[PDB]
PDB file of all heavy atoms in Angstrom:
ATOM      1  N   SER A 262      78.039  43.190  21.949  1.00128.90           N
ATOM      2  CA  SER A 262      79.141  44.122  21.737  1.00128.90           C
ATOM      3  C   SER A 262      79.173  45.152  22.764  1.00128.90           C
ATOM      4  O   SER A 262      78.314  45.413  23.539  1.00128.90           O
ATOM      5  CB  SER A 262      78.904  44.757  20.373  1.00128.90           C
ATOM      6  OG  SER A 262      77.728  45.605  20.283  1.00128.90           O
ATOM      7  N   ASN A 263      80.364  45.768  22.887  1.00130.84           N
ATOM      8  CA  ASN A 263      80.702  46.869  23.888  1.00130.84           C
ATOM      9  C   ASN A 263      80.558  46.227  25.303  1.00130.84           C
ATOM     10  O   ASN A 263      80.212  47.021  26.164  1.00130.84           O
ATOM     11  CB  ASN A 263      79.901  48.169  23.673  1.00130.84           C
ATOM     12  CG  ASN A 263      80.591  49.365  24.386  1.00130.84           C
ATOM     13  OD1 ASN A 263      81.912  49.471  24.477  1.00130.84           O
ATOM     14  ND2 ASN A 263      79.808  50.300  24.872  1.00130.84           N
ATOM     15  N   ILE A 264      80.995  45.076  25.450  1.00133.69           N
ATOM     16  CA  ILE A 264      81.154  44.406  26.789  1.00133.69           C
ATOM     17  C   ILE A 264      82.485  44.675  27.242  1.00133.69           C
ATOM     18  O   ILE A 264      83.492  44.163  26.528  1.00133.69           O
ATOM     19  CB  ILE A 264      80.800  42.943  26.658  1.00133.69           C
ATOM     20  CG1 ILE A 264      79.428  42.742  26.194  1.00133.69           C
ATOM     21  CG2 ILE A 264      81.179  42.244  28.059  1.00133.69           C
ATOM     22  CD1 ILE A 264      78.410  43.062  27.218  1.00133.69           C
ATOM     23  N   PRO A 265      82.792  45.372  28.300  1.00131.02           N
ATOM     24  CA  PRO A 265      84.113  45.558  28.723  1.00131.02           C
ATOM     25  C   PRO A 265      84.806  44.342  29.078  1.00131.02           C
ATOM     26  O   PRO A 265      84.169  43.400  29.689  1.00131.02           O
ATOM     27  CB  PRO A 265      84.064  46.471  29.811  1.00131.02           C
ATOM     28  CG  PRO A 265      82.630  47.070  29.975  1.00131.02           C
ATOM     29  CD  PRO A 265      81.823  46.053  29.139  1.00131.02           C
ATOM     30  N   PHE A 266      86.135  44.350  29.219  1.00129.52           N
ATOM     31  CA  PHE A 266      87.016  43.388  29.903  1.00129.52           C
ATOM     32  C   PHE A 266      86.552  43.278  31.323  1.00129.52           C
ATOM     33  O   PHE A 266      86.436  44.179  32.109  1.00129.52           O
ATOM     34  CB  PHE A 266      88.538  43.949  29.937  1.00129.52           C
ATOM     35  CG  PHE A 266      89.306  43.060  30.784  1.00129.52           C
ATOM     36  CD1 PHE A 266      89.788  41.760  30.289  1.00129.52           C
ATOM     37  CD2 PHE A 266      89.754  43.359  32.145  1.00129.52           C
ATOM     38  CE1 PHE A 266      90.414  40.882  31.103  1.00129.52           C
ATOM     39  CE2 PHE A 266      90.513  42.403  32.893  1.00129.52           C
ATOM     40  CZ  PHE A 266      90.823  41.184  32.390  1.00129.52           C
ATOM     41  N   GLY A 267      86.395  41.963  31.743  1.00130.29           N
ATOM     42  CA  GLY A 267      85.960  41.557  32.991  1.00130.29           C
ATOM     43  C   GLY A 267      84.515  41.439  33.181  1.00130.29           C
ATOM     44  O   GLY A 267      84.151  41.088  34.275  1.00130.29           O
ATOM     45  N   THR A 268      83.754  41.496  32.029  1.00127.95           N
ATOM     46  CA  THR A 268      82.232  41.469  32.156  1.00127.95           C
ATOM     47  C   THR A 268      81.804  40.280  31.317  1.00127.95           C
ATOM     48  O   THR A 268      82.298  40.082  30.314  1.00127.95           O
ATOM     49  CB  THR A 268      81.547  42.751  31.780  1.00127.95           C
ATOM     50  OG1 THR A 268      81.908  43.829  32.518  1.00127.95           O
ATOM     51  CG2 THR A 268      79.983  42.545  31.782  1.00127.95           C
ATOM     52  N   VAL A 269      80.866  39.486  31.889  1.00133.31           N
ATOM     53  CA  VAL A 269      80.423  38.404  31.153  1.00133.31           C
ATOM     54  C   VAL A 269      79.740  38.849  29.752  1.00133.31           C
ATOM     55  O   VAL A 269      79.050  39.836  29.745  1.00133.31           O
ATOM     56  CB  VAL A 269      79.365  37.484  31.939  1.00133.31           C
ATOM     57  CG1 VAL A 269      79.989  36.817  33.145  1.00133.31           C
ATOM     58  CG2 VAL A 269      78.208  38.337  32.296  1.00133.31           C
ATOM     59  N   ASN A 270      79.921  38.049  28.841  1.00134.95           N
ATOM     60  CA  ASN A 270      79.188  38.180  27.529  1.00134.95           C
ATOM     61  C   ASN A 270      78.333  37.029  27.366  1.00134.95           C
ATOM     62  O   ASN A 270      78.476  36.138  26.665  1.00134.95           O
ATOM     63  CB  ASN A 270      80.266  38.300  26.428  1.00134.95           C
ATOM     64  CG  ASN A 270      79.731  38.839  25.122  1.00134.95           C
ATOM     65  OD1 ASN A 270      80.381  39.506  24.364  1.00134.95           O
ATOM     66  ND2 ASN A 270      78.497  38.589  25.045  1.00134.95           N
ATOM     67  N   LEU A 271      77.188  37.174  28.129  1.00139.90           N
ATOM     68  CA  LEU A 271      76.230  36.190  28.301  1.00139.90           C
ATOM     69  C   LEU A 271      74.803  36.772  28.209  1.00139.90           C
ATOM     70  O   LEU A 271      74.510  37.703  29.002  1.00139.90           O
ATOM     71  CB  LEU A 271      76.281  35.364  29.603  1.00139.90           C
ATOM     72  CG  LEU A 271      77.607  34.663  29.842  1.00139.90           C
ATOM     73  CD1 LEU A 271      77.649  34.125  31.309  1.00139.90           C
ATOM     74  CD2 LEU A 271      77.783  33.527  28.939  1.00139.90           C
ATOM     75  N   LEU A 272      73.938  36.274  27.354  1.00138.51           N
ATOM     76  CA  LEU A 272      72.632  36.779  27.083  1.00138.51           C
ATOM     77  C   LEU A 272      71.640  35.697  27.395  1.00138.51           C
ATOM     78  O   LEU A 272      71.693  34.586  26.863  1.00138.51           O
ATOM     79  CB  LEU A 272      72.584  37.250  25.637  1.00138.51           C
ATOM     80  CG  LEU A 272      71.194  37.901  25.327  1.00138.51           C
ATOM     81  CD1 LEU A 272      70.948  39.187  25.996  1.00138.51           C
ATOM     82  CD2 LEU A 272      71.269  38.162  23.751  1.00138.51           C
ATOM     83  N   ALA A 273      70.701  36.022  28.223  1.00135.22           N
ATOM     84  CA  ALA A 273      69.699  35.037  28.657  1.00135.22           C
ATOM     85  C   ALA A 273      68.998  34.325  27.480  1.00135.22           C
ATOM     86  O   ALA A 273      68.508  34.989  26.580  1.00135.22           O
ATOM     87  CB  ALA A 273      68.634  35.672  29.526  1.00135.22           C
ATOM     88  N   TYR A 274      68.838  33.016  27.559  1.00135.24           N
ATOM     89  CA  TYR A 274      68.369  32.234  26.540  1.00135.24           C
ATOM     90  C   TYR A 274      67.643  30.987  27.100  1.00135.24           C
ATOM     91  O   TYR A 274      68.148  30.302  27.894  1.00135.24           O
ATOM     92  CB  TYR A 274      69.562  31.771  25.590  1.00135.24           C
ATOM     93  CG  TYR A 274      69.251  30.826  24.490  1.00135.24           C
ATOM     94  CD1 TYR A 274      68.219  31.057  23.540  1.00135.24           C
ATOM     95  CD2 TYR A 274      69.983  29.735  24.304  1.00135.24           C
ATOM     96  CE1 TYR A 274      67.942  30.255  22.526  1.00135.24           C
ATOM     97  CE2 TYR A 274      69.684  28.770  23.241  1.00135.24           C
ATOM     98  CZ  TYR A 274      68.631  29.091  22.388  1.00135.24           C
ATOM     99  OH  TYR A 274      68.411  28.153  21.406  1.00135.24           O
TER     100      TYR A 274
END
Side-chain angles (χ1 to χ4, degrees):
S262 66
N263 202 33
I264 300 290
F266 175 74
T268 296
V269 292
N270 197 150
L271 299 173
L272 179 65
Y274 175 50

